[PDB]
Enzyme design. Structure first.
Site, short mmCIF file in Angstrom:
data_model
loop_
_atom_site.label_atom_id
_atom_site.label_comp_id
_atom_site.label_asym_id
_atom_site.label_seq_id
_atom_site.Cartn_x
_atom_site.Cartn_y
_atom_site.Cartn_z
N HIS A 49 2.61 26.94 -20.71
CA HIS A 49 2.62 27.61 -19.38
C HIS A 49 2.32 26.61 -18.25
O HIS A 49 2.35 27.01 -17.08
CB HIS A 49 1.76 28.87 -19.38
CG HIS A 49 0.29 28.64 -19.26
ND1 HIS A 49 -0.60 29.10 -20.22
CD2 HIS A 49 -0.45 28.06 -18.30
CE1 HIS A 49 -1.83 28.80 -19.84
NE2 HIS A 49 -1.76 28.16 -18.67
N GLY A 53 -7.76 26.27 -14.19
CA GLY A 53 -7.67 24.82 -14.45
C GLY A 53 -8.25 24.43 -15.80
O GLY A 53 -8.04 23.25 -16.20
N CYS A 83 -7.35 25.66 -18.80
CA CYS A 83 -6.35 25.80 -19.87
C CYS A 83 -6.11 24.44 -20.50
O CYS A 83 -6.10 23.45 -19.78
CB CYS A 83 -5.07 26.46 -19.38
SG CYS A 83 -5.41 28.11 -18.73
C1 LIG Z 1 -6.61 33.51 -10.04
C2 LIG Z 1 -7.98 33.32 -10.45
O1 LIG Z 1 -7.91 32.86 -11.84
C3 LIG Z 1 -9.03 32.98 -12.56
O2 LIG Z 1 -10.07 33.46 -12.15
N1 LIG Z 1 -8.86 32.53 -13.82
C4 LIG Z 1 -7.57 32.14 -14.40
C5 LIG Z 1 -7.97 31.66 -15.77
C6 LIG Z 1 -7.19 31.18 -16.81
C7 LIG Z 1 -7.81 30.85 -18.00
N2 LIG Z 1 -9.13 30.98 -18.20
C8 LIG Z 1 -9.86 31.45 -17.17
C9 LIG Z 1 -9.34 31.80 -15.95
C10 LIG Z 1 -9.99 32.35 -14.72
#
Ligand SMILES: CCOC(=O)N1Cc2ccncc2C1
Ligand SMILES: CCOC(=O)N1Cc2ccncc2C1
Lengths: 306, 306
Positions: free
Chosen positions: A41, A143, A145
């Site tokens: 992704h 960030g 991932c």
């Molecule tokens: C738009 C705000 O995004 C998030 O709060 N995330 C994406 C995201 C992706 C993977 N692990 C944790 C998180 C927390």
């Protein structure tokens, strides 16, 4: 003595983390030999994540569209392929810090360390379990991932997890290092319901043995039980069924403490039915299920890595 | 989202751990530049530990009696000196893996990571707090002495703890890297009573802010309080007094959440008086006090090291 939620030392894995950027998306990659592994992704825009066709999105990508940074050095990408939900980016330089490693797919109830990273830089290390519903309860921000979960057996790092998704309920989903999701989860921003988060019974029993070894003994009762009687009670409290394989695995803790596994099951049964009455066990007011029997032995015998 | 007890990545510190042996005693040393730091009780026999005269025991030691091993390499000891309760062993080789570092003496309520080691080899990493009674609740077996506690600010490791002692009650005592014990503890196997283990109030409030940020909001009540009213209640529950300095430090979490510090104090007050009614906060059935306000900001903003 004392008993802590303990991660593996992270140095071997720190030396493998890189930054991967595709267009405007940056996440983490794992650099082993001359391959960087990252979530597919990375190729998606926020818009794409609604209903991505990864094969179609990949057609518009070339080697030079994947920006791989190891500290201050750019790595040259000489090949890319999609394996399930991961990208494999072939680079022209073997990671000089590659440790001995394996890729393993773990079972629910197994524990591992996560090295949470942002922009290819380590932020922190913590211990997780693969839940019975194939989620993990991590600490992951946008960030993160491509952050990885791992176990170490002496000098060999076994990579078991790569971080991909946060579900609407704030629990985490990801893949093994072949890119196969744990459980039914997909790398799509759609409705994905986690099932029942059951308690890992065998791990609670391990941790009760850890408590006894560390002198926290108040919960030891005067009863025994059978697997069937125990399992009838366990089911009611959304505990995973205990098997004879589980009893066998607890054998060494049984022997060290002189407390028969079924006796410890009867103690656990009373804790479930009666609660902790405001008491603590190893500084916890609930029954901890993120230590395996192997973890308890390891931490109580001081086994070493290098 | 999600909130975990997170240690610093341990790689920078792994590269500094060595084995120190004097006669029949083996423990861990920290190799920075051309100095190895270790507990002075390396010179003691089990017998000596009852009433050791360290100056007298040192008279019978020479440079060649301190065996320093870094993996498979012996280091040549060219000098030794006692500083408080640590030995400084000068070696002829500067550690090539020396990170940027400082020695800091921390205050009670401050948190740090411990890299638990045996025979100079890392076993595990976990997060601790210096308790208000100057003990830590670690996980340490025989041979763990000289394991270190540290914080990282980007690329600079701040060493704050070296492990020396387990008290009869199974809590842990040690020194800063100048060899000064935290609290009244001595490197003697005698009766040393730990005082009251009070709760670090400012850290509980930080963790309540972490809970709100992560959507665990059930405990937010309809009240406010004052520092004096709060402190009268806190004292009764063996909570550390909250000061205006503490209120000021929580300012940024107050601003991010829009919950006034005194409002969060009134929520905490009700939790103390009423208990959690069998509910959890960030997966805990008790109030966690081993996150600082700086830890919560760090983990909730994904700050990085290297
Ligand atoms: C738009 C705000 O995004 C998030 O709060 N995330 C994406 C995201 C992706 C993977 N692990 C944790 C998180 C927390
Ligand atoms: C004689 C058995 O000794 C122990 O059980 N210890 C010593 C010791 C010293 C420092 N930290 C922890 C421990 C646990």
């Amino acid at each position: 003595s004392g008993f802590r939620k303990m991660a593996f030392p992270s140095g071997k894995v720190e030396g493998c983390m890189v930054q991967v950027t595709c267009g405007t998306t940056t996440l983490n990659g794992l650099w082993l030999d001359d391959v960087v592994y990252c979530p597919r992704h990375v190729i998606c825009t926020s818009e794409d994540m609604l209903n991505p066709n990864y094969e179609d999105l990949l057609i518009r990508k070339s080697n030079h569209n994947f920006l791989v940074q190891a500290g201050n050095v750019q790595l040259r990408v000489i090949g890319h392929s999609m394996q399930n939900c991961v990208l494999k980016l072939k680079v022209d330089t073997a990671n000089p810090k590659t440790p001995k490693y394996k890729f393993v797919r773990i079972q629910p109830g197994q524990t591992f360390s996560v090295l949470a990273c942002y922009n290819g830089s380590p932020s922190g290390v913590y211990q997780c379990a693969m839940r019975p519903n194939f989620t993990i309860k991590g600490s992951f921000l946008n960030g993160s991932c491509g952050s990885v979960g791992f176990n170490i057996d002496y000098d060999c790092v076994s990579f078991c997890y790569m971080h991909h998704m946060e579900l609407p309920t704030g629990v985490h989903a990801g893949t093994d290092l072949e890119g196969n999701f744990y459980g039914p989860f997909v790398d799509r921003q759609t409705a994905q319901a986690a099932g029942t988060d059951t308690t890992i019974t065998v791990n609670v029993l391990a941790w009760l043995y850890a408590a006894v070894i560390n002198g926290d003994r108040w919960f030891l009762n005067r009863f025994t039980t059978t697997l069937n009687d125990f399992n009838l009670v366990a089911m009611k409290y959304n505990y995973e069924p205990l098997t004879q394989d589980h009893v066998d695995i607890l054998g060494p803790l049984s022997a060290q403490t002189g407390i028969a596994v079924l006796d410890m099951c009867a103690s656990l049964k009373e804790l479930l039915q009666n609660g902790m009455n405001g008491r603590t066990i190893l500084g916890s007011a609930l029954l901890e299920d993120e230590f395996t029997p192997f973890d308890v032995v390891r931490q109580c015998s001081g086994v070493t890595f290098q």
